[PDB]
Write an enzyme that holds these catalytic residues in place. Structure first.
Site, PDB file in Angstrom:
ATOM      1  CG  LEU A 268      45.757  39.760  43.581  1.00  0.00           C
ATOM      2  CD1 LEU A 268      46.523  39.587  42.624  1.00  0.00           C
ATOM      3  CD2 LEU A 268      46.351  40.604  44.871  1.00  0.00           C
TER       4      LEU A 268
ATOM      5  CG  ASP B 123      47.873  42.153  38.360  1.00  0.00           C
ATOM      6  OD1 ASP B 123      47.245  42.621  39.200  1.00  0.00           O
ATOM      7  OD2 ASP B 123      48.981  41.847  37.957  1.00  0.00           O
TER       8      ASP B 123
ATOM      9  CG  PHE C 284      38.646  47.548  42.945  1.00  0.00           C
ATOM     10  CD1 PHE C 284      39.123  46.965  41.967  1.00  0.00           C
ATOM     11  CD2 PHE C 284      37.462  46.822  43.457  1.00  0.00           C
ATOM     12  CE1 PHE C 284      38.671  45.927  41.133  1.00  0.00           C
ATOM     13  CE2 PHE C 284      36.936  45.715  42.678  1.00  0.00           C
ATOM     14  CZ  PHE C 284      37.626  45.376  41.665  1.00  0.00           C
TER      15      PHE C 284
ATOM     16  CD  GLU D 168      40.885  46.473  37.711  1.00  0.00           C
ATOM     17  OE1 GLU D 168      41.357  47.071  38.533  1.00  0.00           O
ATOM     18  OE2 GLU D 168      41.604  45.752  37.144  1.00  0.00           O
TER      19      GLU D 168
END
Ligand SMILES: [Cl-]
Ligand SMILES: [Cl-]
Length: 164
Positions: free
Chosen positions: A32, A20, A104, A11
């Site tokens: 998010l 993203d 995730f 990430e």
């Protein structure tokens, strides 16, 4: 290597609001904020998440706190899910990490949708699951990351992440 180090690699870390891979407002370590196309809505979600008037920028500490919460929620989501729980219970520690990672990234619902793949993982048919996992939008949209997760399920080692 561990789940946190693993996700931090996948990430990255950004202290300012960003978009993203799907174009959604995000912050920190893949946290998010909203699917809404509105920056203000994003900023509102951020303040509410942090508990302060942020201006769209957070500190490292704040980022880590959201990360910590997000990982715990991922785990908890798996365990409460009828389809996911049994797979996770059947897996070794490294592979468990790979499942958390997928959760995730795409949510429990999303992952719970990989029915056939889940069945093969549960049966410990590594090579077959890997091929199946690759036949997905997920794989086509984020191939490098998907390849890392797939290799992890195939081998049961952290090889895909060693170096990074
Ligand atoms: Cl939150
Ligand atoms: Cl990717």
């Amino acid at each position: 290597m561990n789940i946190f180090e693993m996700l931090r690699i996948d990430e990255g870390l950004r202290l300012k609001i960003y978009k993203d891979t799907e174009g959604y407002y995000t912050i920190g370590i893949g946290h998010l904020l909203t699917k809404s196309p509105s920056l203000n809505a994003a900023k509102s979600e951020l303040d509410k998440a942090i508990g302060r008037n942020t201006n769209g920028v957070i500190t490292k500490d704040e980022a880590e706190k959201l990360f910590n919460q997000d990982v715990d929620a991922a785990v908890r989501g798996i365990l409460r899910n009828a389809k996911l729980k049994p797979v996770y219970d059947s897996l070794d520690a490294v592979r468990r990490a790979a499942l958390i990672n997928m959760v995730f990234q795409m949510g429990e619902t999303g992952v719970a949708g990989f029915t056939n793949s889940l069945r093969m993982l549960q049966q410990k048919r590594w090579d077959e699951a890997a091929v199946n996992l690759a036949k997905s939008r997920w794989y086509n949209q984020t191939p490098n990351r998907a390849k890392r997760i797939i290799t992890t399920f195939r081998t049961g080692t952290w090889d895909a992440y060693k170096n990074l």
